[PDB]
Amino acid sequence: KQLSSKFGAISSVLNDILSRLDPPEAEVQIDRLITGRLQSLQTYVTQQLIRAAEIRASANLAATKMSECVLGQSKRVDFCGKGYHLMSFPQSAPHGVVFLHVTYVPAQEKNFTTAPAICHDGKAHFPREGVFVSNGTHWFVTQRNFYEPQIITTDNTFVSGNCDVVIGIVNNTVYDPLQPELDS
Amino acid sequence: TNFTISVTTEILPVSMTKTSVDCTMYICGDSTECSNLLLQYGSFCTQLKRALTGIAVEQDKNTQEVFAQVKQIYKTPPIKYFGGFNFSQILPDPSKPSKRSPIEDLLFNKVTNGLTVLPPLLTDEMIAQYTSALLAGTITSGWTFGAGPALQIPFPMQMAYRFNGIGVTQNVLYENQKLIANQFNSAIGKIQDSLSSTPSALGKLQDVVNHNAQALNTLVKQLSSKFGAISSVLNDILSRLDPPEAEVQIDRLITGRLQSLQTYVTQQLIRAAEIRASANLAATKMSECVLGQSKRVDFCGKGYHLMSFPQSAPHGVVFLHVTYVPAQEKNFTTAPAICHDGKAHFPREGVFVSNGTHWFVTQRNFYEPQIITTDNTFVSGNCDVVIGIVNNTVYDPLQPELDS
Amino acid sequence: QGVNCTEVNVFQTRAGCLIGAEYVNNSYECDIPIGAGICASYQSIIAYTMSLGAENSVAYSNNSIAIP
Ligand SMILES: *[C@@H]1O[C@H](CO)[C@@H](O[C@@H]2O[C@H](CO)[C@@H](O[C@@H]3O[C@H](CO)[C@@H](O)[C@H](O)[C@@H]3O)[C@H](O)[C@H]2NC(C)=O)[C@H](O)[C@H]1NC(C)=O
Ligand SMILES: *[C@@H]1O[C@H](CO)[C@@H](O[C@@H]2O[C@H](CO)[C@@H](O[C@@H]3O[C@H](CO)[C@@H](O)[C@H](O)[C@@H]3O)[C@H](O)[C@H]2NC(C)=O)[C@H](O)[C@H]1NC(C)=O
Ligand SMILES: *[C@@H]1O[C@H](CO)[C@@H](O[C@@H]2O[C@H](CO)[C@@H](O)[C@H](O)[C@H]2NC(C)=O)[C@H](O)[C@H]1NC(C)=O
Ligand SMILES: *[C@@H]1O[C@H](CO)[C@@H](O[C@@H]2O[C@H](CO)[C@@H](O)[C@H](O)[C@H]2NC(C)=O)[C@H](O)[C@H]1NC(C)=O
Ligand SMILES: *[C@@H]1O[C@H](CO)[C@@H](O[C@@H]2O[C@H](CO)[C@@H](O)[C@H](O)[C@H]2NC(C)=O)[C@H](O)[C@H]1NC(C)=O
Ligand SMILES: *[C@@H]1O[C@H](CO)[C@@H](O[C@@H]2O[C@H](CO)[C@@H](O)[C@H](O)[C@H]2NC(C)=O)[C@H](O)[C@H]1NC(C)=O
Ligand SMILES: *[C@@H]1O[C@H](CO)[C@@H](O[C@@H]2O[C@H](CO)[C@@H](O)[C@H](O)[C@H]2NC(C)=O)[C@H](O)[C@H]1NC(C)=O
Ligand SMILES: *[C@@H]1O[C@H](CO)[C@@H](O)[C@H](O)[C@H]1NC(C)=O
Ligand SMILES: *[C@@H]1O[C@H](CO)[C@@H](O)[C@H](O)[C@H]1NC(C)=O
Ligand SMILES: *[C@@H]1O[C@H](CO)[C@@H](O)[C@H](O)[C@H]1NC(C)=O
Numbered sequence A: 001k002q003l004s005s006k007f008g009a010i011s012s013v014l015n016d017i018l019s020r021l022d023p024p025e026a027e028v029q030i031d032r033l034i035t036g037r038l039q040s041l042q043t044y045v046t047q048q049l050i051r052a053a054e055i056r057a058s059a060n061l062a063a064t065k066m067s068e069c070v071l072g073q074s075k076r077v078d079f080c081g082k083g084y085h086l087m088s089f090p091q092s093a094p095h096g097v098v099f100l101h102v103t104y105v106p107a108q109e110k111n112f113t114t115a116p117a118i119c120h121d122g123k124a125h126f127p128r129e130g131v132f133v134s135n136g137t138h139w140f141v142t143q144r145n146f147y148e149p150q151i152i153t154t155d156n157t158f159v160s161g162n163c164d165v166v167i168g169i170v171n172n173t174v175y176d177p178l179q180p181e182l183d184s
Numbered sequence B: 001t002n003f004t005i006s007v008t009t010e011i012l013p014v015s016m017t018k019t020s021v022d023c024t025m026y027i028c029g030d031s032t033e034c035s036n037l038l039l040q041y042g043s044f045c046t047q048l049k050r051a052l053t054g055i056a057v058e059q060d061k062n063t064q065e066v067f068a069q070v071k072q073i074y075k076t077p078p079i080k081y082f083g084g085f086n087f088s089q090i091l092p093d094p095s096k097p098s099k100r101s102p103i104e105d106l107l108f109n110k111v112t113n114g115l116t117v118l119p120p121l122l123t124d125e126m127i128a129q130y131t132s133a134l135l136a137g138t139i140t141s142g143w144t145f146g147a148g149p150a151l152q153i154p155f156p157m158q159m160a161y162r163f164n165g166i167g168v169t170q171n172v173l174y175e176n177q178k179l180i181a182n183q184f185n186s187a188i189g190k191i192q193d194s195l196s197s198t199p200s201a202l203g204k205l206q207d208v209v210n211h212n213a214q215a216l217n218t219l220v221k222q223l224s225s226k227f228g229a230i231s232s233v234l235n236d237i238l239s240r241l242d243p244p245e246a247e248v249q250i251d252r253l254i255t256g257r258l259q260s261l262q263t264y265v266t267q268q269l270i271r272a273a274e275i276r277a278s279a280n281l282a283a284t285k286m287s288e289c290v291l292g293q294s295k296r297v298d299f300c301g302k303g304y305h306l307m308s309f310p311q312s313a314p315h316g317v318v319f320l321h322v323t324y325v326p327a328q329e330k331n332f333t334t335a336p337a338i339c340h341d342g343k344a345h346f347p348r349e350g351v352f353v354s355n356g357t358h359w360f361v362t363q364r365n366f367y368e369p370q371i372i373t374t375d376n377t378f379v380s381g382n383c384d385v386v387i388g389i390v391n392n393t394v395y396d397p398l399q400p401e402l403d404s
Numbered sequence C: 001q002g003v004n005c006t007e008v009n010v011f012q013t014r015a016g017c018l019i020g021a022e023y024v025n026n027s028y029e030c031d032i033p034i035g036a037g038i039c040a041s042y043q044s045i046i047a048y049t050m051s052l053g054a055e056n057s058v059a060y061s062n063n064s065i066a067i068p
């Protein structure tokens, strides 16, 4: 569109303007037109360079996601979709890529009570990988997600010091394995 | 053996001031000559306004995306007790009607015609509400609230969770819980003193504001230049000179001002790209170090990163990175393995350490002696191919208890 | 935009004044951005303040764990 504008000259035409105008002023008209069109081309290529730089940065981020979400599992939070990321399925797109994100969204929350530690027989108790949880007079252990009660044993728990300084600690009996199998 | 907790500050700017420039009134003030001669250059100033509206909409999208990453806002409980963790200058104070914590209050106090300065889409009130909601969500819901519905976790056990995730056993938290709380309060006081003391700590926001103001000032100064013409006045040539005779002068003036506007817009545009990249990096920082805890090191502050506090700031965001700084070193002797009864033994997760001749096991970043047992070791191969192995016995559990 | 609307139904905003819509005291989801916490939508055309979702404060205590 910018080619068709006269840019303040007599006319936008090139060959026909040479016939009706003398070369001493035709060189002035051509100089004005050549400077204006060079300015327009400079604006267009400045836009091209900045758009190429922005697209290159976005595509470098896309390639980082290509090497991070698709290749294996990424533990980093909400970098590959919303929530925890497990896997991704990329598909071919024109002038771009599209991403799917198999995520893990828990729901159906239930209220529960807990304790930082358990004091029993003058020593403290701490879970090895789980967490103490209870609903009523009975206590259990469970993981971070998808609550699954289990009996407190000595394989999923350990001992660390005594029970004097731990705040909020509560009594609870512990079911130690191999105790009833002693006289067989 | 003994650890300390410090806090640092990181300032990353988010959004520059939006500027809108009209072409015709900037070139000349209410003159028909510009109306009948500016269209001879084609639709040149139309794409300038298109680009500036594009900058306005991407800045609005950027300042919306950098903060609004939660579907629901969170409000703190009226009880301020958090198990020894005192959050008074971090939690927003309802005494002030603007609902601001004193730290961003001090940061706001420290940090300071044909043009148009459009106001931002989000003013400081909703930014303060965003920061309060994010602080509430990261204090009462643990590190798991962005993956779905809201949960509740008390402070000490999610401290234990973060210590388990950083690489130490959670039992060491309750041994010095009051010490950790006192060190946290001292670190908050010290970083408040550092914010109130250092005047050049906020140099990025002042730098970008001064850059924008200086660019506008030089634009205004170079507008009033003659550009090689007879008169520098915009409309005095309409009556002093014949409009047949003013064509070359007005053409030179409009092309000089067009070149100046073009180079100003390109400079601004480049900067706009830079601030968009910086705010995208800040958005990744917030999405990594606030929405859950991260394992990668030297990304959010110096040291092992546990969790961070995002706070409001004009044209930027400020972070409070809580880190783990070990100290109180002590020399000790080690061994890669131990051979007992002709069989090799390996540590489950730790390392064999002996001050003198008595060998003990311990975790990675903390020192505490433990008895070497069978449950924290396994047998794999013989003690013939390894090097640097020592000779000591292993105390067997369930050995002296089943005999009777 | 920007200019005071003493010189020129009428509603006064931070970024100037708005002509053609009535201001309401309720809250609605933002569709058309305006500026300084103003959003507009058509149901007649109206204008309203920015609504940041819904207020929700989860219960917090010294001992309350939530496991899905
Ligand atoms: C908290 O959750 C636990 C785990 O489910 C509950 O313990 C279990 O409660 C059920 C129902 O009362 C017990 O089943 C009963 O077993 C007896 C035999 O002992 C049987 O005769 C009954 O007909 C009934 O099936 C189950 O035994 C019990 N589990 C254990 C290990 O004792 C507990 O009741 C829950 N507490 C509250 C306050 O909801
Ligand atoms: C390296 O550190 C270990 C761990 O503290 C030191 O072993 C400790 O040695 C002392 C003295 O030999 C033991 O004290 C004794 O305890 C028994 C327990 O009944 C008591 O009856 C004795 O009267 C005496 O107080 C201590 O138990 C022992 N600790 C462990 C965990 O075995 C060791 O001495 C240190 N080595 C060097 C070179 O510093
Ligand atoms: C269970 O908790 C109770 C109190 O919460 C503890 O009972 C007291 O224990 C101390 C010393 O252990 C005695 O001097 C008190 O007389 C006890 N009071 C009562 C009412 O029994 C008890 O010790 C805890 N159980 C364990 C195994 O530590
Ligand atoms: C680890 O360092 C802290 C910080 O100095 C020590 O805490 C100090 O303990 C002494 C003795 O109770 C107090 O007089 C100081 O006031 C404490 N310091 C602070 C800042 O409160 C702690 O004792 C050290 N622990 C070990 C095992 O060395
Ligand atoms: C949490 O720390 C703040 C900061 O020190 C405490 O605020 C102080 O409160 C006392 C009593 O009202 C004032 O005399 C001080 O001037 C306050 N310090 C300030 C404003 O810097 C606050 O009391 C602490 N809260 C708890 C529960 O310990
Ligand atoms: C650990 O003990 C074993 C056996 O008690 C040592 O093995 C013997 O080492 C001596 C000299 O080092 C040799 O003469 C024997 O032939 C070895 N016997 C066997 C069965 O290998 C072993 O050297 C000791 N290791 C250390 C580091 O003291
Ligand atoms: C766990 O119990 C608490 C009680 O303190 C619940 O909190 C309230 O629950 C009722 C009923 O759902 C709501 O009407 C209130 O608005 C809640 N108050 C607050 C401050 O959140 C909580 O919802 C329960 N959680 C679950 C998963 O049942
Ligand atoms: C450990 O030994 C080295 C070697 O002599 C010494 O330079 C260093 O100071 C010692 N460190 C401690 C804590 O004793
Ligand atoms: C507009 O002018 C009136 C004077 O009648 C003044 O009260 C009001 O504050 C002004 N508003 C703005 C936005 O300048
Ligand atoms: C409702 O909106 C009007 C708009 O002028 C305002 O004057 C009034 O104070 C508002 N009422 C409340 C309760 O916010």
Ligand SMILES: *[C@@H]1O[C@H](CO)[C@@H](O)[C@H](O)[C@H]1NC(C)=O
Residues within 6 Å of the ligand: B081, C060, C061, C062
């Ligand atoms: C938590 O414990 C403190 C200390 O006694 C108490 O003041 C507060 O009311 C408790 N909060 C509860 C029980 O929700």
